[PDB]
């Protein structure tokens, strides 16, 4: 019965990844529908890592031989949730590689985009993950490696974003990205959307993907 209570770190963007959130929040762009795509993508490489990693060492399949990919909408909480069972990221991974740390590929991209480029092109740059606000308002990254606790990154974007240990379901090892989507951009709950989305720029996985409807 007693309080609870969690520890919290909050982080600031580097300035360019912020000025590139930034720009992908408050311009319109069309085929926006490439968020699922750069997503997917980062969930194969991660699961490419896993994959090798276990040949040397197998026993880092303690925490989940399966090597998949689950998409699940939520209606209800309007969210998109990506789960991998990749490699996961450790707490320094996700201060390093989801926010602190520049990426040579930032600028470029940005001023590609300020210039006509279809947003398609952000993966070329190294900063797919972050095609995620075209259609979220928030994002949160739940994640575990074999080398760590289980960790939750969150951002609304405005600069900032936190980091903490999670207290939700654990899962045995990998990533789930639960997209809080924009008001109107509902139609990525829905399955044929998803299905058609899937089908049109992400049919070289390697690895099983499924998709899970309610109802
Ligand atoms: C193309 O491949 C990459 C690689 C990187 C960045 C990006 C794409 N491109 C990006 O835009 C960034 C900021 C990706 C952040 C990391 C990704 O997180 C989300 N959910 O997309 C994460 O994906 C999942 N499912 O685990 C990935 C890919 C983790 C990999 C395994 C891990 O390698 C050891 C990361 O360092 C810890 C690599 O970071 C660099
Ligand atoms: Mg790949």
């Given at each position: 019965?007693?309080?609870?209570?969690?520890?919290?770190?909050?982080?600031?963007?580097?300035?360019?990844?912020?000025?590139?959130?930034?720009?992908?929040?408050?311009?319109?762009?069309?085929?926006?529908?490439?968020?699922?795509?750069?997503?997917?993508?980062?969930?194969?490489?991660?699961?490419?890592?896993?994959?090798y990693e276990?040949?040397?060492?197998?026993?880092?399949?303690?925490?989940?031989?399966?090597?998949?990919?689950?998409?699940?909408?939520?209606?209800?909480?309007?969210?998109?949730?990506?789960?991998?069972?990749?490699?996961?990221?450790?707490?320094?991974?996700?201060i390093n590689?989801?926010?602190?740390?520049?990426?040579?590929?930032?600028?470029?991209?940005?001023?590609?985009?300020?210039?006509?480029?279809?947003?398609?092109?952000?993966?070329?740059?190294?900063?797919?993950?972050?095609?995620?606000?075209?259609?979220?308002?928030?994002?949160?990254?739940?994640?575990?490696?074999?080398?760590?606790?289980?960790?939750?990154?969150?951002?609304?974007?405005?600069?900032?974003?936190?980091?903490?240990?999670?207290?939700?379901?654990?899962?045995?090892?990998?990533?789930?990205?639960?997209?809080?989507?924009?008001?109107?951009?509902?139609?990525?709950?829905?399955?044929?959307?998803?299905?058609?989305?899937?089908?049109?720029?992400?049919?070289?996985?390697?690895?099983?993907?499924?998709?899970?409807?309610?109802?």
């Open positions: 019965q007693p309080m609870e209570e969690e520890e919290v770190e909050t982080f600031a963007f580097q300035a360019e990844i912020a000025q590139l959130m930034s720009l992908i929040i408050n311009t319109f762009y069309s085929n926006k529908e490439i968020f699922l795509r750069e997503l997917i993508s980062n969930s194969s490489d991660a699961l490419d890592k896993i994959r276990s040949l040397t060492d197998p026993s880092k399949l303690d925490s989940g031989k399966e090597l998949h990919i689950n998409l699940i909408p939520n209606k209800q909480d309007r969210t998109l949730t990506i789960v991998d069972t990749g490699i996961g990221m450790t707490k320094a991974d996700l590689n989801l926010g602190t740390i520049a990426k040579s590929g930032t600028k470029a991209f940005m001023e590609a985009l300020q210039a006509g480029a279809d947003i398609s092109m952000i993966g070329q740059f190294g900063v797919g993950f972050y095609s995620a606000y075209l259609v979220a308002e928030k994002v949160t990254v739940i994640t575990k490696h074999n080398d760590d606790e289980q960790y939750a990154w969150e951002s609304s974007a405005g600069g900032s974003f936190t980091v903490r240990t999670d207290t939700g379901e654990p899962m045995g090892r990998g990533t789930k990205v639960i997209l809080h989507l924009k008001e109107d951009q509902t139609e990525y709950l829905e399955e044929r959307r998803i299905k058609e989305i899937v089908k049109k720029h992400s049919q070289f996985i390697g690895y099983p993907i499924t998709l899970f409807v309610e109802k």
